[PDB]
Amino acid sequence: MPMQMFMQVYDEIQMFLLEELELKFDMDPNRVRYLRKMMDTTCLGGKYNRGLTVIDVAESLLSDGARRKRVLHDACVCGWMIEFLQAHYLVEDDIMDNPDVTVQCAINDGLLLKSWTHMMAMHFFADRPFLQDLLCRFNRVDYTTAVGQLYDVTSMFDSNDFAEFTLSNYKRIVKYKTAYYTYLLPLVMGLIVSEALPTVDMGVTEELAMLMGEYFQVQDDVMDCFTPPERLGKVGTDIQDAKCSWLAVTFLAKASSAQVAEFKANYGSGDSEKVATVRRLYEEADLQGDYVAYEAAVAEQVKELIEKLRLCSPGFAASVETLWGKTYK
């Protein structure tokens, strides 16, 4: 039922958006069909982890028949707002590595996907008292993500270098770039639609979102480097891109002067042998052993904070538990 409901609401949102363009924005059929296809290509095909989390939080916060169906429908629209926001970031990422009409159309896609999050909210929640708070929290999270993208993209530089290759800075990147929109926003949106936002300790929730985000990114960084492309589903480029990865920051705290010198001379290069030298350094430093322990300690902290949350918000803690299970898998 969650996925079937989420897909039914997608059809409803899509039809509203496309009919609105046709009827109110003077759009010709050819462009309407082009936007239908673009929306499908960018918004469908994923696991819908962010979107489905909104639904799971709302269902749990049942602790009137008209109120239930409304809360679940609202959870679905909120879920598609995040899925469209994710679709917008991925398009922006695709421009970041690609009279060129394809580049013009990609920038346009980026702008429409973001505008669509506002359009679907302004319509489906038009009479809801939470509309203003929802829009403000969503916009603030969107800004946070762009800020996180700045921290990430400039980690190996000085915007106006391994100085920012620290665990505390790695955590700042993860929090802003990933954790706020991937873990915190779905949880918060599920709380907003349920009208149960002040009934939860936001501090413990924020802390949980940051911890789950960190667990996910450390695993993502390790997989980027060691999981082969056929198993990973993409080509891992963190070494070549000189990313501030969990592997790089952990390696620098335990490598010798000569090993650090060897790491510095081989990091951030496309050359196959330099990338392999970095992989060799990570392996020889027993980073895979340190990976297991780091993740286990984060897992212990997550498991503990859910209990503190369950003391005042029991239903919410079970939805945070399922969100965690999706990450820990």
Added chain:
Amino acid sequence: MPMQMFMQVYDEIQMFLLEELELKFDMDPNRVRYLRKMMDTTCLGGKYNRGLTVIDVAESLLSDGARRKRVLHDACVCGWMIEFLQAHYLVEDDIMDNPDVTVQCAINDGLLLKSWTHMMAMHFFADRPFLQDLLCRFNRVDYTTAVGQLYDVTSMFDSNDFAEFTLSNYKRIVKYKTAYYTYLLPLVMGLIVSEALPTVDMGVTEELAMLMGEYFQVQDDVMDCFTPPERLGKVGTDIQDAKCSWLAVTFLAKASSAQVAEFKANYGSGDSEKVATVRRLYEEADLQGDYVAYEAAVAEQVKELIEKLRLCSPGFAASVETLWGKTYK
């Protein structure tokens, strides 16, 4: 006083945004100074026609000393919201024609400039009852502009060609791509802050914005083709880019079969002689003569609609008159 006030409020908005990043978003000084410079580079140096229009509308809608200073301050924040929105579109346009950290930073700039319009509104208008309506009208205008950009960029194609080279389609492009954010939005924002939105006939106002936008774009299209780069302040590329320009649509309605064939074989090419052949065709078709008459007829329509607006909204009509004078110049 308007420009001095507008610049004073810029310093105030900038300081709030940058202090917020430092204090609430964990930003390091190096990145704060980098964003201060980027904000200055992208947001300052223009004529501030959109921003100053908001101020001019609010001053006029004076037909309590605490209310005046608030309305004028609000007009300034709204003006900077549009100037930042304009800055965001220009950055997006710069990406449209340019491990590349400059492209990553340009995309990031685009995203921050837009997010800043929301951040400054959410702060300065936090307790205002118009905040929700202002955000919704601004977001709807932003979407309209992205839609207009789609109509523009794909005018010479079929997104899934001279069929869309018509006066009615030219007007659809101008309305969505330019008129809504350049002429309608500054007028509407000046009305919102003054709490005088329902006291005006929106139909006549929308019609005026569309007409002024059209007058401006026809002149812009003619200047792009005939005004030399040292006088224009840029290199005119409409012919090379095969734009749906006022010159192209007017030429196609009056050219002979052989001349249309000659236009079709030479339009949309970078080759210097093909561009010159297009310029020769426009000249020989007496498009400069038709330009004068087209603009004069639009001017007559503008002058007439301001009178209808003055019947119910006198102060507003004088601000629409000054906005027109800035375009007619």
